[PDB]
Design a protein around this motif. Structure first.
Motif, PDB file in Angstrom:
ATOM      1  N   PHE A 296     104.019 128.441  20.821  1.00 46.87           N
ATOM      2  CA  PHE A 296     103.839 128.288  22.291  1.00 46.87           C
ATOM      3  C   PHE A 296     104.513 126.992  22.740  1.00 46.87           C
ATOM      4  N   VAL A 297     105.794 126.893  22.401  1.00 47.47           N
ATOM      5  CA  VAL A 297     106.654 125.774  22.849  1.00 47.47           C
ATOM      6  C   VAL A 297     107.521 126.299  23.996  1.00 47.47           C
ATOM      7  N   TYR A 298     107.540 125.590  25.117  1.00 49.29           N
ATOM      8  CA  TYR A 298     108.122 126.093  26.386  1.00 49.29           C
ATOM      9  C   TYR A 298     109.195 125.124  26.898  1.00 49.29           C
ATOM     10  N   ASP A 299     110.249 125.640  27.517  1.00 44.15           N
ATOM     11  CA  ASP A 299     111.225 124.814  28.270  1.00 44.15           C
ATOM     12  C   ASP A 299     111.539 125.482  29.614  1.00 44.15           C
ATOM     13  N   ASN A 300     111.022 124.909  30.705  1.00 44.79           N
ATOM     14  CA  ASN A 300     111.295 125.411  32.074  1.00 44.79           C
ATOM     15  C   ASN A 300     112.785 125.421  32.302  1.00 44.79           C
ATOM     16  N   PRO A 301     113.363 126.586  32.653  1.00 46.99           N
ATOM     17  CA  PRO A 301     114.787 126.639  32.947  1.00 46.99           C
ATOM     18  C   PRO A 301     115.216 125.785  34.141  1.00 46.99           C
ATOM     19  N   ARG A 302     116.408 125.216  34.028  1.00 48.98           N
ATOM     20  CA  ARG A 302     117.157 124.612  35.157  1.00 48.98           C
ATOM     21  C   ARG A 302     118.355 125.507  35.414  1.00 48.98           C
ATOM     22  N   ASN A 303     118.508 125.954  36.642  1.00 47.97           N
ATOM     23  CA  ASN A 303     119.739 126.638  37.086  1.00 47.97           C
ATOM     24  C   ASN A 303     120.245 125.855  38.284  1.00 47.97           C
ATOM     25  N   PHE A 304     121.547 125.895  38.498  1.00 51.30           N
ATOM     26  CA  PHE A 304     122.187 124.900  39.374  1.00 51.30           C
ATOM     27  C   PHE A 304     123.537 125.410  39.860  1.00 51.30           C
ATOM     28  N   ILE A 305     123.968 124.825  40.956  1.00 53.59           N
ATOM     29  CA  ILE A 305     125.401 124.830  41.335  1.00 53.59           C
ATOM     30  C   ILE A 305     125.785 123.383  41.623  1.00 53.59           C
ATOM     31  N   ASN A 306     127.084 123.102  41.597  1.00 56.04           N
ATOM     32  CA  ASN A 306     127.669 121.768  41.856  1.00 56.04           C
ATOM     33  C   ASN A 306     128.653 121.908  43.013  1.00 56.04           C
ATOM     34  N   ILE A 307     128.457 121.156  44.072  1.00 54.59           N
ATOM     35  CA  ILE A 307     129.460 121.158  45.162  1.00 54.59           C
ATOM     36  C   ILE A 307     130.212 119.832  45.150  1.00 54.59           C
ATOM     37  N   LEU A 308     131.489 119.908  45.509  1.00 47.87           N
ATOM     38  CA  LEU A 308     132.408 118.753  45.612  1.00 47.87           C
ATOM     39  C   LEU A 308     132.756 118.567  47.080  1.00 47.87           C
ATOM     40  N   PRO A 309     132.068 117.680  47.815  1.00 46.27           N
ATOM     41  CA  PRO A 309     132.367 117.496  49.219  1.00 46.27           C
ATOM     42  C   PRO A 309     133.754 116.888  49.366  1.00 46.27           C
TER      43      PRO A 309
END
Ligand code: FAD
Ligand SMILES: *[C@@H]1O[C@H](CO)[C@@H](O[C@@H]2O[C@H](CO)[C@@H](O)[C@H](O)[C@H]2NC(C)=O)[C@H](O)[C@H]1NC(C)=O
Ligand code: NAG
Ligand code: NAG
Ligand code: NAG
Ligand code: NAG
Ligand code: NAG
Ligand code: NAG
Ligand code: NAG
Ligand code: FQ3
Length: 518
Positions: A296-309
């Motif tokens: 019962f070892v857990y890692d909350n996902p990170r999902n992302f986008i990157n914008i270049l202003p």
């Protein structure tokens, strides 16, 4: 909000009772031994030292050795730095293939983290079914907040993202609040308004300097047990030269493991506390069979986008949170780099930014997907264990990522974000993207979620309350042994758990002192 910290230098006063583990005069009997000078372990040892003789053992060195750990501006540096085995950031790769890091330093992950401070979701306590003293929980939050938490100053990017979250319907506007609640808020930070990092090591300043000793570069290799009424009695630790040392608890004292989601299960397994068939298969003598150690070892996902202003944005630390039940969102703005901060992107193969960028992120709650920690070496605690999280093995986590990614879509469509587009077109294709942009039926969002996942770095589990521990954090079947750190809970207390684990260290310290009181 009377109970917040001031702008101030990082308080290293506690170094007057910090010693090299090479010093054999640290060896002997204490009332308490705390293993891991981290987020929970520092406030735990400080609290126990009010009444009793405490030895805190930390494998890493002191933060003064790595000055880039002490400022907001230094955050990227510590991840960019190569892991030579002594650095405050230890690199690992999960068996899923996702790059990750853990702390190796006195103050633990609070010395290397992104500074975001929040209290647990107030429904968390009743969800656990533990008989919490809720008044004491809140006093213990105030004791932490008074020492190391500030109300952050305005940062232009955080203000843009907050306006965007609100326009995207992440309501209501909670203003400035430390509480984990649905809506958009400014939360607290352990970076002060001068950018000085404050951390769990500074809670050692609340300890009694006549009762608290800290050994650094102390690598705890084994928990020692009574020979027969099974009790923890002490530890073996090695020093930076490789020599071995022993320390013991006495009378009604206790050993507490605070070595983190990775280090606590690893040390329990090395000490013969864990699944009988697994340990027997490694010829490790079983002291206490428990099928759930490192499970019962857990890692909350990170999902992302990157914008270049197309015009520069000012770098920021995260202070503005967009919270729903099914997703927790933030955004950081960063300078460009040609050396990547390890684990920011999930592999070393990720394209590098040439100009300033906003990393815009969604976190899956729970998560429901879990894996395990297993030993790589059956003897050497300096060899990292294997860890697997099984990201998105549970379809509910995938469904929540899809909802989070659609909300980041809404955020990219706000008037708030419009000025950061490279082309004044109607669509979100008007942004310039670093890496994969958002793809709007579900299959394309599912692929995006699965293929572009990173660690949120908020991993937890491996020694759960109700599996390995009782409701008082005692290892079931063993006297004088507790676990207090992020190994203890299967679901996040909130979006940003350092606040909960700082509080937990002192709280369980106060529970141990009350249990022992007359
Ligand atoms: C890069 C990063 C950014 C993060 N950002 C945030 C954020 O902004 N806000 C937030 O709320 N949360 C954040 N988190 C998560 C949060 O900081 C952690 O989940 C929390 O600090 C974990 O506390 P812990 O006490 O379980 O572990 P730790 O604080 O890691 O403490 C464990 C300690 O034990 C020591 N140790 C391990 N094994 C041994 C051994 N055998 N002998 C001796 N010592 C040992 C380690 O060196 C370490 O100091 C972040 C995490 C990371 C990695
Ligand atoms: C705060 O924690 C609670 C309890 O775990 C979260 O769960 C909500 O509560 C009800 C029952 O308490 C459950 O049916 C749902 O899982 C949640 N409610 C809704 C409407 O989804 C709650 O979501 C957490 N709050 C936040 C903002 O994260
Ligand atoms: C302000 O931050 C600077 C940055 O290094 C530091 O010199 C100083 O400690 C801070 N001011 C204080 C503690 O008042
Ligand atoms: C501890 O002592 C050794 C020399 O015996 C040295 O190599 C090491 O850097 C010292 N560590 C700390 C944290 O002072
Ligand atoms: C504890 O503080 C929270 C805000 O963080 C508040 O909602 C709650 O009512 C408090 N609980 C008690 C028992 O005082
Ligand atoms: C060891 O175990 C025995 C069980 O035979 C128990 O009664 C006793 O309290 C323990 N004694 C010591 C000294 O560890
Ligand atoms: C365990 O020890 C036995 C000898 O008693 C041996 O047959 C077996 O291969 C060993 N297994 C491991 C994994 O060391
Ligand atoms: C230990 O880790 C290595 C490299 O990280 C891995 O490939 C290897 O299979 C692991 N060994 C064991 C026994 O788990
Ligand atoms: C997902 O998690 C829950 C545990 O909350 C479990 O009951 C459910 O069956 C799991 N679903 C899958 C697809 O494994
Ligand atoms: C939200 C999260 C993970 O917080 C920290 C962070 C830091 C940098 C510095 O380069 C860049 C992006 C970033 O995003």
């Amino acid at each position: 909000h009377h109970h917040l910290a001031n702008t101030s230098a990082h308080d290293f006063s506690y170094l007057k009772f910090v010693y090299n583990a090479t010093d054999t005069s640290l060896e002997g009997s204490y009332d308490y031994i705390v293993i891991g000078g981290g987020t929970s372990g520092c406030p735990l040892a400080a609290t126990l030292s009010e009444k009793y003789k405490v030895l805190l053992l930390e494998r890493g060195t002191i933060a003064t050795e790595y000055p880039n750990t002490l400022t907001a501006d230094g955050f990227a540096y510590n991840l960019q730095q190569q892991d030579d085995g002594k650095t405050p950031v230890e690199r690992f790769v999960s068996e899923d293939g996702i790059d990750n890091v853990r702390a190796r330093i006195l103050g633990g992950t609070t010395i290397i983290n992104a500074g975001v401070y929040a209290r647990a979701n107030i429904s968390f306590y009743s969800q656990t079914g533990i008989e919490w003293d809720l008044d004491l929980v809140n006093k213990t939050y105030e004791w932490v907040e008074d020492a190391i938490v500030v109300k952050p100053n305005n940062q232009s990017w955080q203000s843009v993202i907050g306006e965007g979250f609100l326009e995207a319907g992440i309501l209501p506007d909670n203003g400035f609040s430390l509480d984990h609640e649905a809506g958009t808020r400014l939360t607290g930070s352990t970076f002060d308004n001068n950018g000085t990092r404050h951390a769990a090591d500074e809670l050692l300043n609340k300890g009694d300097p006549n009762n608290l000793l800290v050994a650094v570069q102390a690598s705890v290799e084994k928990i020692l047990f009574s020979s027969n009424n099974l009790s923890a009695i002490g530890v073996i630790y090695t020093d930076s030269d490789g020599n071995s040392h022993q320390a013991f608890v006495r009378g009604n004292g206790e050993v507490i493991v605070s070595a983190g989601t990775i280090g606590t299960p690893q040390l329990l397994l090395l000490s013969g506390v864990g699944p009988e068939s697994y340990l027997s298969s490694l010829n490790i003598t079983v002291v206490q069979p428990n099928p759930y150690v490192g499970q019962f070892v857990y890692d909350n996902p990170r999902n992302f986008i990157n914008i270049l202003p197309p015009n520069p944005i000012e770098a920021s630390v995260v202070t503005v949170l967009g919270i729903r039940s099914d997703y927790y969102q933030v955004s950081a703005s960063s300078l460009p780099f040609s050396t990547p901060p390890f684990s920011l992107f999930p592999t070393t193969s990720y394209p590098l930014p040439n100009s300033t960028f906003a990393h815009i992120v969604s976190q899956v709650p729970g998560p429901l997907s879990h894996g395990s920690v297993t030993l790589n070496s059956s003897s050497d605690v300096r060899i990292a264990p294997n860890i697997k999280f099984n990201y998105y093995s549970n379809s509910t986590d995938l469904a929540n990522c899809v909802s989070g990614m659609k909300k980041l879509g809404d955020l990219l469509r706000t008037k708030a974000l419009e000025p950061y587009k490279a082309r004044d077109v109607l669509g979100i294709d008007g942004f310039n993207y670093l890496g994969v942009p958002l793809p709007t039926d579900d299959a394309s969002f599912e692929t995006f979620c699965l293929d572009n996942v990173a660690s949120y770095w908020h991993y937890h589990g491996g020694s759960l309350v109700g599996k390995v521990l009782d409701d008082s954090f005692r290892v079931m079947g063993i006297k004088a042994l507790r676990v207090v750190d992020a190994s203890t809970f299967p679901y996040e207390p909130n979006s940003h758990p350092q606040g909960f684990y700082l509080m937990l260290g002192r709280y369980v310290g106060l529970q141990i002192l009350q249990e022992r009181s007359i």
